[PDB]
């Protein structure tokens with residue numbers, strides 16, 4: 099009973115393994131569909147079931163992800179470290195099905211269903227903290243969630259409040275609680291298993307990955323630095339799909355790539371005479387210089403708390419992966435002082 103592209107054919111009210119009962123669809127992706135379900139063997143707890151196509155490569159992909167979720171569950175027995183919880187998984191007629199705790203909209207969907215209006219800085223703070231907290235729990239267990247984006251950070255609950263802005267004559271949404279979870283472990287890699295060559299989503303991709311210099315945990319921090327910027331202004335920091343433009347935007351926003359990285363990268367067609375081969379006086383050259391600025395010029399306030407957020411973002415968008423801030427040292431960063439510890 100299969101779709102023309104491999105998906106399960108279901109309707110509201112269908113049952114799965116006479117155990118789950120479909121209520122709604124939450125979304126879809128290339129891999130399959132996520133459905134809201136009631137789980138009558140967990141006393142009617144509401145779950146989110148992921149239904150992946152009959153396609154083998156996805157079936158095998160999910161088996162790897164199921165292993166990562168198994169390990170997360172093994173090393174967070176009290177569900178304190180803010181990665182999504184898998185309650186169950188089963189093979190259903192060639193469809194791999196994973197049972198997750200029910201959460202809300204992503205931090206991206208909310209940001210766009212609010213017209214790409216940034217989150218207020220004190221929300222950026224609790225979101226950034228939880229992000230680092232959860233990705234540090236992975237690093238402390240020899241993992242790299244290879245694919246961090248606002249799409250994969252779910253609000254536990256994205257109920258909000260509407261308020262009218264007298265000042266700016268605008269209807270503003272404000273999510274009530276900022277508890278998040280990190281999701282989508284389909285790409286996470288233990289330290290000891292095989293590493294893909296290219297990982298992450300172009301906009302959140304670290305330069306070491308681009309220059310094929312070898313990657314591990316530090317490349318997540320790069321991602322996190324990009325998501326934080328987006329949380330704070332609404333738009334992605336790097337808006338490209340080409341390597342040389344990408345590498346050129348980084349040089350615009352962060353200054354020149356260090357020579358240690360250049361001389362060592364085998365991607366030498368991007369450089370001439372030790373420097374990035376890029377002519378600012380061209381077609382794409384002045385598209386880059388016009389469409390993004392040095393980092394701290396994106397500051398919307400000289401308040402010291404705002405300078406502390408860009409102090410943070412600057413340390414995660416460091417070129418050299420080992421000069422790059424670690425999540426351990428990030429939970430200790432001055433920017434997170436105003437938070438209440440627990």
Ligand SMILES: O=C(O)c1ccc2c(c1)nc(Nc1cccc(Cl)c1)c1ccncc12
Pocket residue numbers: 124125126127130131132145146182198199200201202203204252281282283
């Ligand atoms: O991959 C996971 O680990 C993963 C795990 C859980 C959820 C999820 C993705 N996506 C949700 N939303 C969503 C939104 C848009 C498209 C798609 Cl496919 C899904 C969702 C909602 C409520 N509860 C859990 C989830």
